[PDB]
Amino acid sequence: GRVYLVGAGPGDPELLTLKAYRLLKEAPVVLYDRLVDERVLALAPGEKVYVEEIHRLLLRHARAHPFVVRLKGGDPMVFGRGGEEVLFLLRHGVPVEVVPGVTSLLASGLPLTHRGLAHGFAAVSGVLEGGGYPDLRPFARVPTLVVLMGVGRRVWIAKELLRLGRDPREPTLFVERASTPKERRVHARLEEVAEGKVEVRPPALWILGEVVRVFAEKEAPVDALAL
Amino acid sequence: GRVYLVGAGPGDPELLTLKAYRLLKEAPVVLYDRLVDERVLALAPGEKVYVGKEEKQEEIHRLLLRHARAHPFVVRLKGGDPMVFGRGGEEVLFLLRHGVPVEVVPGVTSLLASGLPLTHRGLAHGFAAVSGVLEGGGYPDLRPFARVPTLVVLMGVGRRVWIAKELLRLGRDPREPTLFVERASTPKERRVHARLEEVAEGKVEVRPPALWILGEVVRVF
Ligand SMILES: [Cl-]
Ligand SMILES: [Cl-]
Ligand SMILES: [Cl-]
Numbered sequence A: 001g002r003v004y005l006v007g008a009g010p011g012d013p014e015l016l017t018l019k020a021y022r023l024l025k026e027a028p029v030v031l032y033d034r035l036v037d038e039r040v041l042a043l044a045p046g047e048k049v050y051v052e053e054i055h056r057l058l059l060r061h062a063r064a065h066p067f068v069v070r071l072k073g074g075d076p077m078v079f080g081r082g083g084e085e086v087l088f089l090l091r092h093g094v095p096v097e098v099v100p101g102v103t104s105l106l107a108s109g110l111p112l113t114h115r116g117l118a119h120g121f122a123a124v125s126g127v128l129e130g131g132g133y134p135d136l137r138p139f140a141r142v143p144t145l146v147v148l149m150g151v152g153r154r155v156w157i158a159k160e161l162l163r164l165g166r167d168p169r170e171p172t173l174f175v176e177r178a179s180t181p182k183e184r185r186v187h188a189r190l191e192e193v194a195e196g197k198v199e200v201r202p203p204a205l206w207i208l209g210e211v212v213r214v215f216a217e218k219e220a221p222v223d224a225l226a227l
Numbered sequence B: 001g002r003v004y005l006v007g008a009g010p011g012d013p014e015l016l017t018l019k020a021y022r023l024l025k026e027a028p029v030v031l032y033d034r035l036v037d038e039r040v041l042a043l044a045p046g047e048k049v050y051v052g053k054e055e056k057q058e059e060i061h062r063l064l065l066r067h068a069r070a071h072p073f074v075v076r077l078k079g080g081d082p083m084v085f086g087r088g089g090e091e092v093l094f095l096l097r098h099g100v101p102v103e104v105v106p107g108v109t110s111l112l113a114s115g116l117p118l119t120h121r122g123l124a125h126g127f128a129a130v131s132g133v134l135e136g137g138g139y140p141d142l143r144p145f146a147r148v149p150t151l152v153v154l155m156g157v158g159r160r161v162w163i164a165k166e167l168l169r170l171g172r173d174p175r176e177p178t179l180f181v182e183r184a185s186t187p188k189e190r191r192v193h194a195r196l197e198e199v200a201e202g203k204v205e206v207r208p209p210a211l212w213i214l215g216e217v218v219r220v221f
Helices: A018-026 A055-064 A082-091 A154-163 A190-194 B018-026 B057-069 B088-097 B160-169 B196-200 B216-220
Strands: A002-007 A029-032 A047-050 A067-072 A096-099 A120-125 A144-148 A171-176 A184-189 A204-208 B002-007 B029-032 B047-050 B073-078 B102-105 B126-131 B150-154 B177-182 B190-195 B210-214
Touching: A002 A018, A002 A055, A002 A082, A018 A067, A018 A096, A018 B018, A029 A055, A055 A067, A055 A082, A082 A096, A082 B216, A154 A190, A184 A190, B002 B018, B002 B057, B002 B088, B018 B073, B018 B102, B029 B057, B057 B073, B057 B088, B088 B102, B160 B196, B177 B216, B190 B196, B210 B216
Parallel strands: A002 A067, A002 A096, A029 A047, A029 A067, A120 A144, B002 B073, B002 B102, B029 B047, B029 B073, B126 B150
Antiparallel strands: A120 B126, A144 A204, A171 A184, A171 A204, B150 B210, B177 B190, B177 B210
């Protein structure tokens, strides 16, 4: 039958879309991948299957039912090989409907665009399909830059951005497990990351740019938004 | 009281988050800006107050402060995700500076309204997003974004020829496929295809609003 490629959001089940929620409650089968929060899965009463060899495993269930749900973290169309799964499915006649989600890029609550600091932003992956390194040159000077899958390679990424002209004193922020109870924010200047001084564990969202300090009190290092 | 800065999604009410929906259904007052979809607004039973502008903002800030002080909580509804392309950062800053508690509720950003892949093996390993209209109606310095594999432009229909020309001036491929998704996330959604060249030449017809995606992913379909 039909495959609904659904964004699970960054983690907090409340950030599921109304559409995603209804499809999860109603789906006979939910093919999820690693990126999916336990709280969101617990909302699905149907068959939960942890899911190329991912593609064919998708095809089999799509055929077994009237429709199935293929659940991916954040929004399915960015940084998740969603495009690949869509192609494969369409090429095998399987209809596909995409249900956008709250991308993790937006899970920090910070204004990625802000008057006088950034009029746009860019997002890039530290790991490519195949395991390679990203070409950071087209991204090096965007005022606000967000990096996904950049924790393991943070030193190399930081050094490369410094080489490409980013400000070594630029404030940056790592948000580990954003949206969840284990969310831990790590503040560091770009140079401190390049110097291998920052401890961070994946998965983590990495935001670089002055917007990072937008809600910091003037009179002290206090995050006015959090408090 | 508290202010919830809430993302309305790109248009389709079904793309509201559970959290945004819960808040909209219970808010005594909803302060919405111009780009919030009609269908979303109709779901809110409380007092609906237009607090927006078409590119003043200090006025908007004072209105937000006035309503927030008169209720246990209010909802400040914005199109897409409240924290990108809507001056949400300024609104939150002003409120925090006035001692008003604020909670941000992310949304499905308009950048993602077309359901098309912005990143794709071999074509784009990241993307950039920019607006054709800045704070105060200013024009954007496109130099930082000109070469990103996949570029998405919001509010770029009116100034599409200038934008395309700037992009060409800044090094972007003239033959690059682009796509306009007119009235994305609505029943009236329409798609227009064209190479960067055609836009720069004034050969493309699109009426606002529209989401504009540039890059080889457009032809991945
Ligand atoms: Cl995502
Ligand atoms: Cl370390
Ligand atoms: Cl948005």
